[PDB]
Design brief:
8 strands; eight-stranded antiparallel β-sheet; globular; mainly beta; Lipocalin; biotin (chain A); secreted (chain A); binds methyl 3-(4-oxo-4,5-dihydrofuro[3,2-c]pyridin-2-yl)benzoate; homotetramer; 114 residues
């Protein structure tokens, strides 16, 4: 299922546990940073994926970028499991610079290094 | 300044605690309407007028209903006399592969303390 | 009343647009932010026969940030809808992509939202 | 410039664009089969003097989903960059906004990504 170690298309490492209560917990390496999120613990049974999302704030004991990324996507099971996401990366800014505070992109995760 | 009750422009209620370790925990009401949220924030933001970066996720399942979807909010907290949390969001639904192209909505929410 | 006219966003930009009978948007955009000076060409499209159920009118346009004065090597697209009324408004969300190397492409695109009114805020 | 010609996305859509000398993009966006009911006008803009340091060429375009046969009351904008070479690509992200009432405006806009090739 969702629990496991995943890799995006650029080589980041996403180590996640999907708990019984809908919780996502784990670490993200782009050293390691804390992540938390949520997932649908009772998905549909019609072939649809499992909706999920998580957040990393880019502060650890070694660096602070004053920013945070959220990933929103779905887990698609099968022979080659995948998590397909789109993400928003917001930096702390002054009000005058807030218009350019948020980057957007898309990450796809598999259980194999790219 | 983050811990407490927040209200968006469309009548939703965001009840959050900002923990010392960078955790966001709480509930989102958009009892049957209340959902768990979890996320992260920068616990050591700059002191130069910049906002505090943060994000959180709600999966739209509770003990009463399940939309098979999840929203992530990415944004910044801005303190002061009229404090705000300014966000952009992504809402992904679980879909089949054929319908995945239309799986994700995007928008923006502004939260106030009053 | 209608899309054709001069509009202003919340940050002081000026959007001068003509909505043609064939669905064409043409005009000029002047930005108060970024690596920008004076007017830039815009082109886009709008729904020339919107629904009659109270819905807004879908539209979109593009500015490439090159003119006779500067070139930021970037382009913004706005996607949104015109909402008529006593306080006419165009509500948009936008994507701003810069030309980058492949190694930097992951951070090539900014996202935001602009609301336009015919009265300058 | 390398942009003028026919491009194909990952899901069976096609467009034929002309990149004009002063930055104009004009053409048609259609389906793989290309029947008239699936063809729509596209207009946009591109950077006609891109950097020479290996960076891509920024561009964008819009299609409103109305033609002489149907009208979805919606419009898509694609924002991205052209990357030249033997395996040329246009890499984009897109926003698809539908006309809605104010009560439904919160769910008016889909977001996604498209990659186009010449093959
Ligand atoms: C201001 O600081 C930043 O912008 C920053 C810092 C550290 C890591 C990241 C990072 C990693 C990553 C990823 O793997 N997928 C999508 C987005 C993303 O963003 C961003
Ligand atoms: C497809 O959407 C759903 O299935 C669904 C179900 C329940 C609630 C929501 C909801 C509430 C909310 C909000 O307050 N801000 C931003 C997004 C957002 O989405 C979405
Ligand atoms: C990376 O940014 C640039 O290269 C750049 C250059 C010139 C203008 C802009 C600009 C103006 C504007 C606006 O009014 N609304 C939404 C977006 C937006 O972007 C961006
Ligand atoms: C015949 O086609 C239609 O009736 C129609 C209606 C609404 C949207 C779209 C459409 C196509 C498309 C694409 O290729 N990339 C990103 C978005 C996108 O949207 C097509």
């Amino acid at each position: 299922g969702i629990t496991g170690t995943w890799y995006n298309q650029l080589g980041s490492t996403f180590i996640v546990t999907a708990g019984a209560d809908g919780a996502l917990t784990g670490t993200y390496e782009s050293s390691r940073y804390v992540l938390t999120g949520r997932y649908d613990s009772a998905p549909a049974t019609d072939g649809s994926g499992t909706a999920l999302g998580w957040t990393v704030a880019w502060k650890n004991n070694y660096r602070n970028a004053h920013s945070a990324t959220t990933w929103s996507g779905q887990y698609v099971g099968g022979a080659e499991a995948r998590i397909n996401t789109q993400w928003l990366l917001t930096s702390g800014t002054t009000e005058a610079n807030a218009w350019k505070s948020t980057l957007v992109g898309h990450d796809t995760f598999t259980k194999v290094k790219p």
